[PDB]
Amino acid sequence: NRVMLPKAAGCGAGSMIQRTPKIQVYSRHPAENGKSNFLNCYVSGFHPSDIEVDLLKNGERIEKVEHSDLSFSKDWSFYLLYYTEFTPTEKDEYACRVNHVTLSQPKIVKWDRDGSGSHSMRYFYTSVSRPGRGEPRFISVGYVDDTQFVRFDSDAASPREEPRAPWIEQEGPEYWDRNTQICKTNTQTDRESLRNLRGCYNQSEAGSHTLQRMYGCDVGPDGRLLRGHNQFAYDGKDYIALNEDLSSWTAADTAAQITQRKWEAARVAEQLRTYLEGTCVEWLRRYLENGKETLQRADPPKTHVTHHPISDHEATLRCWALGFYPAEITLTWQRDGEDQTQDTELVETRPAGDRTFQKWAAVVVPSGEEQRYTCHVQHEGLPKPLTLRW
């Protein structure tokens, strides 16, 4: 259940970070001809949020592709999963084509075939002005751990808080009407906040800017609050955050300090603390119980090692983790028991599309010395860490 958020203050009386997308193209399951599968293109770590993604087959654009609702990572960078059902063959070449302001031409990536008891609730808000093209777009999503359960999109035909997980559907009309109202109000707040922030930085009304907000709570196995959060970013960078004491603020610069003093005088922190200690944890406990059959089940990783020769003198060992939930995992390579921190390559953890996640860690090793390396796997669905070799 959401909370009403305060408005950023105007200043009366300067940097844009651009991150280019990471792109991973992969199937949900190990690919086997004839058997239907899912082709995924995961685009992550990008900023700003506008992006164009096509799945290609032998160079041709695939229609019907779906994608996830826009959300972002802890560093404020955005991620999206684009996916389609497909049946691979031997000589069909699949690819993902991505365009973004950081790319001087579209980038094509081919498909290369070769628990704990603690829980979190988060709401993620993205508001993007579009000068000359109407009002800002507002998209927000709610998660319990790594499971999305609501979305709101101000560009939907009828903007509403919408269910996105089966266990939320049982909530009555009061729940949907109330949280819709908070969204529609949080919409107009962020709209005035975008205007105020533009003025604080003397920015032109001709340019697009991004407001991102996150709040929610962490609970332990017994249901008690472990930590509350309420963060605010402008153009992909920290702006103002509620501190861990839920009673003071950290402001990034002199503009954000004006907002800090406004929220201090209005006692915003006290209102947020009341929400985080009460409503937030109370509804998180309720969701955990209503969805316990999926939300309180950790799926351990299915793990294996593959060998890919880099010529006849060295080779890549790749440690694979598949089908795990939640997403948090640690993969480490060791040589004679010592971690290969310097030489281990780690891809970003990526969604399978079926709620589970995937990751690999790779290290190049001297040929004939593969047997000295072991992959170490830590996941909350594993009673003990796993160790594997090639």
Author numbering: 323 to 335, 999 to 1099, 1999 to 2274
Quote the original article.
Human leukocyte antigen (HLA) B∗39:06, B∗39:01, and B∗38:01 are closely related class I MHC allotypes that nonetheless show differential association with T1D.
To understand this difference at a structural level, we sought to compare the two highly similar MHC molecules presenting an identical peptide. To this end, HLA-B∗39:01 was produced as a sc-pMHC, including the covalently linked NRVMLPKAA peptide for HLA-B∗39:06. The peptide was positioned as in the HLA-B∗39:06 structure, with the first eight amino acids (NRVMLPKA) occupying the peptide-binding groove. As F-pocket residue 95 differs between HLA-B∗39:06 (Trp) and B∗39:01 (Leu), we concentrated our structural comparison of the two allotypes on this region. The other dimorphic residue between HLA-B∗39:06 and B∗39:01, though not in the F pocket, is at position 97. In HLA-B∗39:01, Arg97 can hydrogen-bond to the carbonyl group of Pro6 of the NRV peptide, while Thr97 of B∗39:06 is unable to do so. Subsequently, using our cell-free competition assay, we found that the 8mer NRVMLPKA bound well to both HLA-B∗39:06 and B∗39:01, consistent with our structural findings.
